[PDB]
Amino acid sequence: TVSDYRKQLEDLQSELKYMQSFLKDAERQKRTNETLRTLVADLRELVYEAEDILVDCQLQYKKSKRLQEINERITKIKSQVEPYFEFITPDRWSSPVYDHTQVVGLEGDKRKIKEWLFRSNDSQLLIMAFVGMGGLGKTTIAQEVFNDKEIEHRFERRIWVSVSQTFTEEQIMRSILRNLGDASVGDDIGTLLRKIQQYLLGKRYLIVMDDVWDKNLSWWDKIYQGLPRGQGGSVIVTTRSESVAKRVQARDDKTHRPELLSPDNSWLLFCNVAFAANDGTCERPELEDVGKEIVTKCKGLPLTIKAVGGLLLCKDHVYHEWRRIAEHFQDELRGNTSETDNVMSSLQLSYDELPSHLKSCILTLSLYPEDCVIPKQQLVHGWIGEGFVMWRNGRSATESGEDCFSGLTNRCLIEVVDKTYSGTIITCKIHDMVRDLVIDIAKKDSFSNPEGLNCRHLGISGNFDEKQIKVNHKLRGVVSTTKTGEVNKLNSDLAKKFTDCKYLRVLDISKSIFDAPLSEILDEIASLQHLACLSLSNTHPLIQFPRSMEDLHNLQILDASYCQNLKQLQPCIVLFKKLLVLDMTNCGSLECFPKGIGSLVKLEVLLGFKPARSNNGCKLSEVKNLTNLRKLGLSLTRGDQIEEEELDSLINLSKLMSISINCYDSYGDDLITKIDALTPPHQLHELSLQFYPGKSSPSWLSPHKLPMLRYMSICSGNLVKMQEPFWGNENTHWRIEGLMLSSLSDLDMDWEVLQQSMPYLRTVTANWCPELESFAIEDVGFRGGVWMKT
Amino acid sequence: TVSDYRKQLEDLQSELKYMQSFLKDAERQKRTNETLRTLVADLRELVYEAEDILVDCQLQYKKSKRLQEINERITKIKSQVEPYFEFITPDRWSSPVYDHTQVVGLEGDKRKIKEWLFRSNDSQLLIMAFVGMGGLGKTTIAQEVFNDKEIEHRFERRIWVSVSQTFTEEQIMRSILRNLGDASVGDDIGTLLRKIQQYLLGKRYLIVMDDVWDKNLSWWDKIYQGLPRGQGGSVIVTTRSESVAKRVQARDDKTHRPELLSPDNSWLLFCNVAFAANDGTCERPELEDVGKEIVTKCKGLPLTIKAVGGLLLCKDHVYHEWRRIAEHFQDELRGNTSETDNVMSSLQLSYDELPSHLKSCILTLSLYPEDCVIPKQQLVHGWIGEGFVMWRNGRSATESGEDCFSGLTNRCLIEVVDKTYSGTIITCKIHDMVRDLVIDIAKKDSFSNPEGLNCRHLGISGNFDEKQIKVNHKLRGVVSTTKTGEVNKLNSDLAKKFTDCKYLRVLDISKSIFDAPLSEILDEIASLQHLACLSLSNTHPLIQFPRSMEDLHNLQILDASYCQNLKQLQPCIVLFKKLLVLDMTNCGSLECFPKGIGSLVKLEVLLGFKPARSNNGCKLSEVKNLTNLRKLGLSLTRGDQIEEEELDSLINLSKLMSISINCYDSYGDDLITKIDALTPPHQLHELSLQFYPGKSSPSWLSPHKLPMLRYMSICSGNLVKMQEPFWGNENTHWRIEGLMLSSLSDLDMDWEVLQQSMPYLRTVTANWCPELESFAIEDVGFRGGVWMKT
């Protein structure tokens, strides 16, 4: 029982190795019967248990008991379910034919797309994209366009092609020939391309390709060269992605995005569907309040509105079922009136073409309240923390979170909320039909139960001081989800029971007020061993994080932002050498670092550095050692924060992208004189100096010292004018693109001098500059404009 | 546990017998899901372990323990993976339609192929071949040819036929009829051949057959007789092989080989692809250095250039992703932008039609540096050594390495570097996309890991005196890979740990300098038992190879070339009788052999014989016993090296092919008089006498004494003129084809006398003969020419 402990280890290390590979195959299988989905549904929990207890291999007898009992469990369920598979022996389309009476107003978009199609001869081959989420109006606006009369006056051959998510090239191109009027010839591929090329000479053709996905998309540029150019032809690709809109490369302007319906438009849509007997009109007025409540709760999608209309069409129009459907809503559209209309299938097919890590990343958004506005940064740090992101080829921590987030937003699953001047995204939200889809998929494998026992991670809402959330010992994550402004009122015993979870990788506490100081609350985090992230942002009783933080050897990131009382950072955040993000933004009262910051090397984000004094903290000398970082945040207080021969400490950062300088609590002119030798690298994408007590430019702000600057913002400051190296217009220019001047009451410059010094501007967002009165925006003084040029 | 030792042996001998036969089937299977590829990936390692420990059957209790534990391991993984297969239930083409705007210059090749097609009436049926590696420009140059207007003026029926690697005859010939304009008739085969013959009377036809492979190719001469001749028809076969170019037998001159792109041409190709928005022009100049670095690193293939262009087309054109793709390159084209363009598939399909021994032989080229120029001889000896080559029917050692190497170079996987006068190949290299393809296939089964633990063989680069290469106990081979000029600086402990590997079949040390003499370094090679090859060429501390070489009973070849200090060869290289190659070329200080060289009989190559004196070494008498050799190398020093009645020792070598005579350190005229009785056999393919102190011809150099001589070279010498038997032009002639006269300052003859005495010459390469001034080359004196006649 002890001598075989390695052997009875390693077969488990084999068996997990097979079974998750089996769980990379069964979801790629169509026609899933009930036994298949049930044994996948418990093999996922069994995978969680196996890789849960497998980490304990890093007496040697109780572990052998655990290995033995779970091996017997897995072999028993295999031999228990296999004869049921021994016993038994083992479509979506579209069309240009629609009804044109229930189409609630689209005539502005119809007009815009018709004036887009009238300019087809201006390009060689006008291609267009209709990008939006599932069931939004894309195929209907396409059918509304090219069934108009004026398009048939313009285009003489109109071709509809229904490309499903499952297809082949052969049926696509022979369907093109069937729409061309040629007979269905049993024929091979190159002859079909020759025929498609031959039937399109001198003909102003319009093809509309529907439901184009990003799966084996290379067929596009096996037929894109087969289309004749210069004839004024036009392609309209309707799809659910911007990634295919750039792979087809329509244009950034030729993409049309349909919008959600207004409540008046959605209400007469629902009248036209549900009350279809008496001419689409409401007959009895006791249903109008409940009906308008249902319609305003459907929130804009025509698919859900027509589904609820088809659901209520087979009732007797009495008040009680209407009222209960108004208060029980999600549970019926997931029954689909027992599988007839299938809204959930039309969104689940958009779910079911993600990569598996993106499936895991989109699955965690079932953990948030009703319409909360989710910050990007917390999602990205959770994904990096509990391991939904892998990396080897340099795309290590932050940029992999960036392209996973952009991969989700390019599937039209997550929509943005606000965007800065520099195009980066800070907050995002999701449509609620996607939200309860992801909840119902979390109602499977024990990702997010949230009722009952078996959960793998949990999210806390507001004010659980008294409601006593159940917490079992599985708990791979604990997140704090607030609805943009509330604070989770928490007591002490829940935070004590957080430290009882052995397997807890994500612990982020974002808006919470505790009863005791957090030094003795989290004193037993030595019991936490495989913890990857901590964002202890915005907590009241935090003064000193606990001193039992020596055995946390994993600790991939460490966040504490906007906590104004953080006096001492311990010297134990030096030795563990496996850090990625250290993030202290705007933490005022802070003794500005420990010593060996340059000792750990694998970190990428270092915000709020506060370079220390002589016999204090750490200087800027070891920043030369940090050859992997790409975001860096400085904040300066007085003159002796920086040292003379360290003033060239920012030239050897090869992979650096952005710099933020926070000279908020500045003291003397010595700081102003000593800033001007800090030279950024010649590669630099964004810089944001934001309080800057100097009066002139910092004397490196020139295209000679940093040529590749694209985005730039200047917040508040004592800045009066720019020096002569700031223009430098003999032959060099900025190649800068986004510029922001937030609150400057002393800054004076011109506008055409900027336009002859910055030839590549797009937008300039200035909103408090009472002294220019020469820019093209509506007022550079009190309010703000953007100057979105052509 | 002991009485069943035979039984528990032999079932393993059965089980390996099944499982590798299973591993001769699963790679012939399409639609490989994840569980299939994972259990193939560990059954390969399990095959290596099974046949690794199976050789130990030649106490009897520990071996029974080993047999028992691996049998339990194999049966456990079988019963562990079988229910996952119980659970689940179980295209490439081309066209004459292309874009003709991105085609970067081919007008010289287009012109040459058009003047080839203009001479179609000169032959009965002009057939042509386009031979090159995968993704080079073959189908594009074919499309560029027969979509020209003048070809349609010439040929009235142009037929494109896309023959994939998976096909049938029926679809090929009905596609021929579909291109002929006949309707797609559901019809059988002989009627289709009759129709194809009937539609081609009096019609100047052009057919282009694309991607023709060497798999069931007999369909060619089931339709080659069906094509009408004398009409001026033309066939263009584009393919990836010269073997099919000779099986179709186009001509040796009618084959066109496209070349890699120039850096200017590849740069405007990359501009035309990547910057496709603004007319294929670069817009911002900070990307030109990184862009040209990527383009010059892609090295000529249009496929990789258009793949990198399609990869960078979906980015935001900022500097940082461009720079990291410039420094992380291979890891993205093996993700294929998550399987959309698939360069790796287009080369892996060329990998996946090799025979399995050729798969193993091509797999070992993942063991070399970036662009090193690999000698043929080391590869061939490694393949013979560790057993990728089997032989029974006389093709025993060297010629099987020759036709395996020619089989790899005829797939356009390995390209040549330099070639001698006699057409034989000495050094070869590979394109780097093939190289990291073979690395990624070695990233599978533990052939070549090279990082981490599990390796089956290892290759050392330069200067590992201090870097301490990890070496586990598996290690079936250890090769030394140098980049044409460096020497692997090695210490003593690595060479001591080489002798710790129990299972080591290939040990070749080609460019290394050691610290201690190799007599005591390799003293414990008695621990080596299954060692097959040793090339101890070019090592400094080698004076005497160690005397523990009595138990090496396998030792298939033994090489030590260009090691100038090798005094004594031990008498233990007589008794082991299983030698193939003994190769001492140019080893100066050497006591010229042991005695029983004629005792061992199964050897093929014996270079640098140095025939001994009377009571010394070995004479030429036992060379009559060596009835299997085909390459033989003599080197002569003075007169008593050879004996009188041994002067007919070279007439009974039936299978001999080549003779090299090295009379470098010659002494007296007695050697010149005693050479002239050494008569080669009447079959002789190449001879190279190279220092030859005599003044006349050796008096056997005549078509009477050796009729079948084809290739011949004469290096430096005191030779003045040729005797009258050297011409012999009454009716006999040389039938010689390649001739080389390297550095002769006394040799005088004519040119038209050679042309009337050697009617079958092709090239005569003379480069230092200051005294002829009558040959057709540019200068027979200081420089050299080749005289490549028509």
Ligand SMILES: Nc1ncnc2c1ncn2[C@H]1C[C@H](O)[C@@H](COP(=O)(O)OP(=O)(O)OP(=O)(O)O)O1
């Ligand atoms: N403006 C509209 N007026 C009335 N019904 C509409 C309108 N737009 C859409 N619909 C209805 C028609 C269908 O019943 C349903 C789905 O429309 P459809 O065009 O298929 O969605 P879509 O094309 O945006 O998504 P998908 O790509 O999944 O098809 O919505």
Ligand SMILES: Nc1ncnc2c1ncn2[C@H]1C[C@H](O)[C@@H](COP(=O)(O)OP(=O)(O)OP(=O)(O)O)O1
């Ligand atoms: N001269 C060229 N100019 C521009 N693109 C080219 C040129 N030659 C080849 N290409 C591009 C076209 C395709 O995108 C890609 C593959 O070329 P292609 O001719 O299909 O390969 P090939 O015929 O040499 O081998 P294979 O048929 O085995 O792929 O290379």
